[PDB]
Amino acid sequence: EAIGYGYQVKNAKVDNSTGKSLTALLQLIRNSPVYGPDIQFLSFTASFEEDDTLRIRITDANNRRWEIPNEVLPRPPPPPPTTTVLSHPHSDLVFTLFHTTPFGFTIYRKSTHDVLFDATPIPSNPTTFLIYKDQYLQLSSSLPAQQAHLYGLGEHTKPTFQLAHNQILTLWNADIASFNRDLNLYGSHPFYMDVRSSPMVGSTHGVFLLNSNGMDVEYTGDRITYKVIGGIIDLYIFAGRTPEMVLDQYTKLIGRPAPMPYWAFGFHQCRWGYRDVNEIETVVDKYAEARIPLEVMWTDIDYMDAFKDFTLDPVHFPLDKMQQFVTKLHRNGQRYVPILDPGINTNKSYGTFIRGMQSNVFIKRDGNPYLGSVWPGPVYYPDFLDPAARSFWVDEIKRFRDILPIDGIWIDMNEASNFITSAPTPGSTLDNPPYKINNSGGRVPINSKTIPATAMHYGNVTEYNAHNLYGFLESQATREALVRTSNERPFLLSRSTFAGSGKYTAHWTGDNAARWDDLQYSIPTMLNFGLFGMPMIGADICGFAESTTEELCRRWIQLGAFYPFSRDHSARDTTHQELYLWESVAASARTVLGLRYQLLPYYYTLMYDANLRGIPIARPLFFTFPDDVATYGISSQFLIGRGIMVSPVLQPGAVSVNAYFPRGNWFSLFNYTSSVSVSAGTYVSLSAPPDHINVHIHEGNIVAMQGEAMTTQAARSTPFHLLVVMSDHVASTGELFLDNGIEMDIGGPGGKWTLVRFFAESGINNLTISSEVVNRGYAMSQRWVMDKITILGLKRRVRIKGFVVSVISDLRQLVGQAFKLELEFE
Ligand SMILES: C[C@H]1O[C@H](O[C@H]2[C@H](O)[C@@H](O)[C@@H](O[C@H]3[C@H](O)[C@@H](O)[C@@H](O)O[C@@H]3CO)O[C@@H]2CO)[C@H](O)[C@@H](O)[C@@H]1N[C@H]1C=C(CO)[C@@H](O)[C@H](O)[C@H]1O
Numbered sequence: 001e002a003i004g005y006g007y008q009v010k011n012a013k014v015d016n017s018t019g020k021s022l023t024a025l026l027q028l029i030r031n032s033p034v035y036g037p038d039i040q041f042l043s044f045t046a047s048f049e050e051d052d053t054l055r056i057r058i059t060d061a062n063n064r065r066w067e068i069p070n071e072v073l074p075r076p077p078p079p080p081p082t083t084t085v086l087s088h089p090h091s092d093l094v095f096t097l098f099h100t101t102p103f104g105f106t107i108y109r110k111s112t113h114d115v116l117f118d119a120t121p122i123p124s125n126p127t128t129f130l131i132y133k134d135q136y137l138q139l140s141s142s143l144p145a146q147q148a149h150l151y152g153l154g155e156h157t158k159p160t161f162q163l164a165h166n167q168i169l170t171l172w173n174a175d176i177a178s179f180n181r182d183l184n185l186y187g188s189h190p191f192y193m194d195v196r197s198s199p200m201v202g203s204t205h206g207v208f209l210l211n212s213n214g215m216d217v218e219y220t221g222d223r224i225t226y227k228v229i230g231g232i233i234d235l236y237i238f239a240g241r242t243p244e245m246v247l248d249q250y251t252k253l254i255g256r257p258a259p260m261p262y263w264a265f266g267f268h269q270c271r272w273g274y275r276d277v278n279e280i281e282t283v284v285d286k287y288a289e290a291r292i293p294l295e296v297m298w299t300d301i302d303y304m305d306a307f308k309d310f311t312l313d314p315v316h317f318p319l320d321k322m323q324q325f326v327t328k329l330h331r332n333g334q335r336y337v338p339i340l341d342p343g344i345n346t347n348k349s350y351g352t353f354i355r356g357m358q359s360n361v362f363i364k365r366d367g368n369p370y371l372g373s374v375w376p377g378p379v380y381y382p383d384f385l386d387p388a389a390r391s392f393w394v395d396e397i398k399r400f401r402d403i404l405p406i407d408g409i410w411i412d413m414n415e416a417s418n419f420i421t422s423a424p425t426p427g428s429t430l431d432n433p434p435y436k437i438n439n440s441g442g443r444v445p446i447n448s449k450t451i452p453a454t455a456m457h458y459g460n461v462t463e464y465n466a467h468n469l470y471g472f473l474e475s476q477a478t479r480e481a482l483v484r485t486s487n488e489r490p491f492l493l494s495r496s497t498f499a500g501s502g503k504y505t506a507h508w509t510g511d512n513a514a515r516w517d518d519l520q521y522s523i524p525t526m527l528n529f530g531l532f533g534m535p536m537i538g539a540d541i542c543g544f545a546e547s548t549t550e551e552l553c554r555r556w557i558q559l560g561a562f563y564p565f566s567r568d569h570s571a572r573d574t575t576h577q578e579l580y581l582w583e584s585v586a587a588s589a590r591t592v593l594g595l596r597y598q599l600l601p602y603y604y605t606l607m608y609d610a611n612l613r614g615i616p617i618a619r620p621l622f623f624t625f626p627d628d629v630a631t632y633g634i635s636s637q638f639l640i641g642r643g644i645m646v647s648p649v650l651q652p653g654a655v656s657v658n659a660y661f662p663r664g665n666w667f668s669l670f671n672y673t674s675s676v677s678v679s680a681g682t683y684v685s686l687s688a689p690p691d692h693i694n695v696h697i698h699e700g701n702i703v704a705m706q707g708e709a710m711t712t713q714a715a716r717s718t719p720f721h722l723l724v725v726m727s728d729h730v731a732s733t734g735e736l737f738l739d740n741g742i743e744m745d746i747g748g749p750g751g752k753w754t755l756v757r758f759f760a761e762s763g764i765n766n767l768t769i770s771s772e773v774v775n776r777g778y779a780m781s782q783r784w785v786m787d788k789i790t791i792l793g794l795k796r797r798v799r800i801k802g803f804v805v806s807v808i809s810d811l812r813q814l815v816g817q818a819f820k821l822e823l824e825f826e
Pocket residue numbers: 175176177180271272300301339412413417495510511544545570571
């Protein structure tokens with residue numbers, strides 16, 4: 001039998017007397033036994049959510065099906081031959097329903113007529129049909145192969161940021177190490193961005209399937225096809241047309257990136273295997289002796305009593321010593337983050353288990369708590385869809401925090417990971433689904449090393465449907481526990497994620513390896529998590545698995561000092577890799593962490609921008625240069641903010657790197673006299689000695705920096721130095737957001753914050769540098785001072801009333817007081 005026969009339009013109508021939506025009823029042409037029962041009648045709606053977002057929702061006309069609950073991911077409710085067209089005068093997107101047999105639909109741009117999503121079937125080829133079976137949804141669009149450049153569909157390790165043609169991407173959260181290319185990893189993000197090189201260069205849109213079920217997405221260059229094993233089609237198309245606008249639109253739907261406290265941009269140290277409190281104190285002390293900044297010390301599962309959450313090893317990490325350790329960190333302006341796993345050990349004398357049982361908080365299967373295996377041995381898993389389990393989790397965190405202060409939490413193993421695979425329930429098509437997704441690259445059963453699909457959650461929800469939400473739900477509950485126990489802005493790092501997780505948590509790339517490949521893989525993954533609305537992202541510096549080398553670690557701290565989340569972490573069976581252990585690594589770390597710390601106000605401003613509009617901190621070159629098609633395929637360079645580009649060495653033995661430079665003039669942030677100037681964008685062979693990484697700022701940008709220091713608190717008390725990079729063709733601008741670094745509501749109505757905008761423009765004989773300030777009172781009360789301005793990008797010197805560098809020193813200006821400074825040429 002054929003896979004399916006598709007659907008015909010039975011009726012369709014655009015609702016008059018309203019900002020139009022379109023409603024249609026589809027009927028199945030013919031049943032097929034392949035992949036299980038076809039849904040006979042579908043309700044099909046297309047509607048505009050905003051002018052820039054089109055929503056296409058396809059459900060069973062006669063029965064409710066699983067959808068991600070509104071409480072989990074709040075969003076506007078669904079709307080209340082021949083073609084049927086839907087358009088709005090203030091929308092660029094035009095929707096068309098084609099009454100062919102089988103039927104089709106397209107979305108195109110009113111302005112350019114470019115077709116963005118084309119689900120018109122090829123009548124002879126059922127692989128192109130919409131097929132809608134209880135456990136097999138198939139939706140396919142053709143694509144213009146050479147002109148469509150796609151990014152996203154995480155989480156997967158790949159050597160390229162742009163998706164390669166001819167691959168299958170599987171979304172099924174799994175405890176599979178990120179050192180493995182291609183395989184489905186810890187998170188599922190069914191979003192892609194499509195940048196078109198033609199007809200209008202840089203025209204971008206986004207496509208999101210809001211569905212938490214397992215799926216395979218097959219991309220062959222001229223087509224992309226979703227093959228989803230449950231749920232509904234609830235497809236959102238975001239009009240763009242710039243890549244930035246796409247992410248603003250996408251995060252408006254899934255949630256804005258959470259704000260992060262200023263200290264989370266400091267350097268973090270962790271290792272699986274630290275043996276006792278004396279060892280972690282020694283590591284903190286050695287960082288200080290090496291003069292390498294260290295902001296946060298982390299403890300992995302070693303700190304627990306026999307790997308049990310909410311306990312301390314009474315021999316190796318005794319409470320009195322841990323309390324002294326944390327008090328000392330805090331006296332020195334440092335912070336402490338411990339790990340938590342979701343599985344609760346089943347020991348009848350363990351207080352956490354006793355309380356979990358009393359509140360009936362655990363996931364069940366066959367009516368009994370589901371017994372998994374993780375680090376402490378036998379565990380039950382809290383059901384984070386159950387309000388009682390969330391209350392339990394809040395209470396356990398409160399109890400532990402009351403005994404040992406903490407500054408944030410790292411939540412791991414929350415796919416959920418299970419070290420055993422349970423036998424499938426006989427006869428269940430959930431544990432034995434008719435279509436097998438490409439789990440682990442080998443069509444491995446979905447229950448492998450996780451909680452079985454037939455396990456049940458609050459509201460009679462199956463693990464089959466809710467699996468991909470577990471990590472996301474635990475992050476919501478964990479952030480709530482932190483907010484309920486401290487008035488500071490919280491900090492959370494989570495392994496497993498789903499679309500929307502960025503509203504609650506940071507992420508890291510997971511179990512990478514100390515390999516040169518993985519050093520490079522960290523860049524596409526960092527860029528992808530920006531697109532996923534999770535801009536606080538990084539990889540374990542020097543590599544988690546396998547022993548690192550001096551050279552790899554030196555090149556990795558050079559790159560990793562620029563990740564939004566910068567942490568050295570390592571597995572227990574490997575050589576130690578704290579940055580002070582090799583002199584060449586330590587010397588490089590001091591240099592690059594020095595620059596990162598000077599850039600703290602800039603990272604923090606970019607965090608504020610990400611929370612406001614979804615724009616990532618670490619971004620692809622084509623976010624700033626979308627009209628430059630040469631940037632679309634770059635995977636080994638990235639921007640921090642608009643105009644700073646990092647071009648790392650990624651090969652052993654190299655003392656140069658061939659790096660792409662977009663049109664214009666670029667200046668090294670490590671030596672302002674070193675510059676690159678290109679006309680048409682091109683590759684430049686940058687010198688990159690063992691102790692150096694290339695980081696350049698482009699003309700047209702102004703960045704406010706503060707001084708180096710050993711802690712971010714100390715850094716905030718230093719003077720500001722403004723770096724102004726002039727351009728011959730456009731005025732230069734920049735922005736600085738300031739608050740106390742820890743307010744719950746960032747930029748809220750309380751007004752405990754200031755936003756400064758900087759401007760600079762050259763006349764024929766003068767130069768004006770100025771600022772404009774919103775809420776001057778607050779920055780004034782914080783005493784922030786701008787004592788220097790450096791001006792790059794001109795070929796003549798300026799003073800107060802080849803390229804040269806002009807420095808205006810001794811200013812003593814309050815950052816809170818708007819200024820206008822007039823300079824003259826020499
Ligand atoms: C520590 C890590 O352990 C577990 O994962 C490891 C597997 O047990 C190993 O067998 C090995 O599996 C890889 C095979 O060697 C390779 O041939 C290929 O099949 O890929 C396999 C990996 O999928 O390596 C795995 C990763 O080291 C466990 O599943 C994983 O969750 C553990 N990592 C977390 C645990 C801790 C300790 O609390 C944290 O330090 C880490 O940051 C966590 O991510």
